Design an enzyme around this catalytic site. Structure first.
Site, PDB file in Angstrom:
ATOM      1  CG  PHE A 104      15.703  34.692  -7.663  1.00 30.32           C
ATOM      2  CD1 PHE A 104      16.117  33.957  -8.764  1.00 30.32           C
ATOM      3  CD2 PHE A 104      15.420  34.022  -6.475  1.00 30.32           C
ATOM      4  CE1 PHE A 104      16.293  32.587  -8.669  1.00 30.32           C
ATOM      5  CE2 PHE A 104      15.618  32.638  -6.380  1.00 30.32           C
ATOM      6  CZ  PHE A 104      16.040  31.935  -7.480  1.00 30.32           C
ATOM      7  CG  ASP A 118       9.091  36.453  -3.850  1.00 27.96           C
ATOM      8  OD1 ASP A 118       9.408  36.163  -2.682  1.00 27.96           O
ATOM      9  OD2 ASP A 118       9.655  35.935  -4.843  1.00 27.96           O
ATOM     10  CE  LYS A 148      15.744  32.632   0.058  1.00 32.09           C
ATOM     11  NZ  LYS A 148      16.965  31.792   0.024  1.00 32.09           N
TER      12      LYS A 148
END
Ligand SMILES: Cc1ncc(COP(=O)(O)O)c(/C=N/OCC[C@H](N)C(=O)O)c1O
Ligand SMILES: Cc1ncc(COP(=O)(O)O)c(/C=N/OCC[C@H](N)C(=O)O)c1O
Ligand SMILES: O=[N+]([O-])c1cc([N+](=O)[O-])c(O)c([N+](=O)[O-])c1
Lengths: 397, 389
Positions: B126, B211, B240
């Protein structure tokens, strides 16, 4: 360890070439650098600080929500997002609102939604997107490919396909390329980065009629021209042409990173009235919306435009530098005469030296995008500084 | 069909403090989800509130026509603490990944060949929901149905080094990998696989892109997961936890790679604004301490011991995995496809948890979650498990 302009080159990717001074504090339309030099802000962070710097109402919303709840994932909604969704739904054609962070993200959702709606409601082969030369829609691979500046979309490997570019304001060209395999027409009602060029009424009306004929969705990118910039809440309201999907960012949060995609229930059902939205962002955007969406503020945008335009006309009478003054509300473009073609940056730099912050819109156009509530005193002071800068450049001629 | 998780109308969070959240009815929940690993210092952390309010009185936004102090201060901290020599700030993990993937493509284009365009990525990856990032992501269901995808992306299984070796060539510009696949069942790279990627990227002159949007900024108990593995990527993305709930992200790389971009190659209206960077600086200053990073390991074992006790009583888990305070608990075959039901049961019991696919429970609490909240929340989760089984 002092932070200086030189520090930028040691730290950030070399994608920007920022000014030689560093703003550290701002109030309203005045900004101070590290030396306490005072600047008048007619740039607005590129049409973002629509209520100026550290507006008390926006600071209050930030602080209040900042003590309460900053963050929810998209599993949840939150009160600030519901409130903002409701205000957008009540004020516009929208029945559904999706919140994101940036204009790029809002446009990704709009363009994905237009593609997906076509896929599931018509055919997986209905994929063509019509967009316009000089358009700017963001920097993701998809949005920059819908953007109309090859210089910015070349060199990143295979671009998402089925995007066709024709000239802005050329309705015949749109007619020519559209067909039953077309899913969307994407347009800025005023092209901001592209030289501050407004759609003609016939062109924009024509896009609506062609979208209706071909069962394509009309997508208005109002990231720059929305949220009061033109003197209406959204530019589509000036024109009387209702899009199927609209995107908003920049002024939406008065400086806080936030964006929105607005559409109908029928279209959004291809994916309650809101989706997403950072609680902090939406609290600030709610306070921003409450101020901008008032008769008085919207009237003032037109008063203030004329104050700017009178100064630009006075400058041209004295110095003979502009061929055209255009835009709407407090998005103002002033095109340089052929003698000064390509030299917009020279005037921007002289402007900064004189203590006023202005923008370009390409190398031939000066762009002004001040706070929507910029005080008259600041309009006159900043435009006197700009006149002084123009004088200094022209004296060299 | 893959069902999403949405809260009904009777569950709207209105207030958070630390690892506790209250809804509109005043029901109190212990937060083991962190808004999907975002609120890494919990809700309304006093230092982050202070940074927000003080910078909020001073300067929010000037655009990248200017630089600003909070951004340069944060960039210096990231450079000092990591392999990075240059950074770019954006507003979300999706945007940082777009920047990374564009940079890897452009670097190959200008340094080697316009034809060096293949990106290798992994099943179940993702990377975000923009068209490009979802196409690099490894769930076809999420990338189908938006018209023509950006081409030259190849997917192989996570942790399968042979498959990577098989697809890579001189026309490959990048390998994109999450060091731990968060959404993809909380699956950690093996040491051999991750080092293998570095060696293959070196061999083929391709850039290794990590990532770390979910696994970075302290989540694993190191500042970045690459530090646990001792494998240094060419480009890394972070978001985040970086902003503790404020939207901000960063793309990290070297000067040599950064120099492939020129003025106007990429940009962002809001990216790098001083308000975001002041908040992320305050977050970074807390997370990047020996004491917080040590506590993440202590706290992980507190959670894991509870999960093991739940399993001893109810026989529901086949595996407990992840790193630091990214925890996955895979359901036994008897409970295949029940992760959403355990999540909703948790909410009824007053504890907020995550899934990582339909068979896996996920936990991503505040990195400073109090021991008392770990015990109370895990007792609530045990009660929820008792209701399900
Ligand atoms: C009509 C329109 N649509 C979309 C965008 C993208 O918004 P963003 O992602 O918030 O920067 C913009 C943003 N313009 O920003 C100026 C350019 C930017 N600084 C860059 O270089 O990317 C816009 O004007
Ligand atoms: C490894 C990895 N890379 C990128 C992202 C996207 O980051 P974001 O744009 O900051 O949400 C994520 C985000 N995961 O969050 C969950 C999903 C979210 N609600 C969505 O669907 O976009 C990630 O885990
Ligand atoms: O109002 N102010 O916050 C303010 C701030 C600064 N400064 O240097 O950051 C000034 O120089 C002035 N000033 O010069 O009036 C005012």
């Amino acid at each position: 360890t002092a932070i200086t302009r030189a520090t930028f080159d040691e730290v950030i990717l070399p994608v920007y070439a920022p000014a030689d001074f560093i703003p550290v504090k701002g109030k309203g339309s005045r900004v101070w650098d590290q030396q306490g030099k005072e600047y008048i802000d007619f740039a607005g962070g590129i049409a973002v600080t629509a209520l100026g710097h550290c507006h008390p109402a926006l600071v209050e919303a930030l602080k209040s929500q900042g003590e309460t709840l900053w963050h929810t994932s998209n599993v949840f909604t939150n009160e600030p997002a519901l409130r903002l969704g409701r205000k957008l739904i009540d004020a516009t054609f929208a029945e559904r609102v999706l919140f994101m962070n940036s204009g790029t993200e809002a446009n990704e959702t709009a363009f994905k939604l237009a593609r997906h709606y076509a896929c599931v409601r018509h055919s997986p082969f209905k994929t063509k997107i019509i967009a316009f030369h000089n358009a700017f829609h963001g920097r993701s691979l998809f949005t920059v490919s819908v953007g109309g500046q090859p210089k910015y979309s070349d060199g990143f490997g295979p671009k998402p396909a089925d995007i066709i570019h024709v000239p802005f304001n050329d309705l015949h060209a749109v007619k020519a390329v559209m067909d039953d395999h077309t899913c969307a027409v994407v347009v800025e009602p005023i092209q901001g980065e592209g030289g501050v060029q407004a759609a003609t009424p016939e062109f924009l009306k024509g896009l609506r009629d062609l979208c209706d004929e071909h069962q394509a969705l009309l997508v208005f990118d109002e990231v720059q021209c929305g949220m009061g910039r033109t003197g209406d809440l959204f530019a589509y309201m000036h024109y009387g042409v209702t899009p199927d999907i609209l995107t908003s960012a920049k002024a939406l949060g008065g400086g806080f990173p936030v964006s929105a995609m607005l559409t109908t229930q029928e279209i959004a059902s291809a994916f309650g009235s809101t989706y997403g939205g950072n609680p902090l962002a939406c609290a600030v955007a709610g306070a921003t919306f409450d101020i901008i969406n008032t008769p008085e503020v919207l009237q003032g945008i037109h008063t203030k435009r004329q104050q700017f335009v009178q100064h630009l006309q006075a400058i041209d009478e004295q110095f003979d530098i502009f061929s055209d003054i255009r835009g709407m509300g407090l998005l103002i473009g002033a095109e340089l005469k052929p003698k000064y073609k390509g030299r917009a940056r020279d005037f921007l730099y002289a402007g900064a030296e004189a203590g006023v912050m202005v923008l370009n819109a390409g190398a031939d156009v000066m762009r002004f995008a001040p706070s929507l509530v910029v005080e008259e005193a600041d309009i006159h002071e900043g435009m006197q500084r700009f006149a002084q800068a123009v004088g200094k450049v022209v004296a060299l001629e």
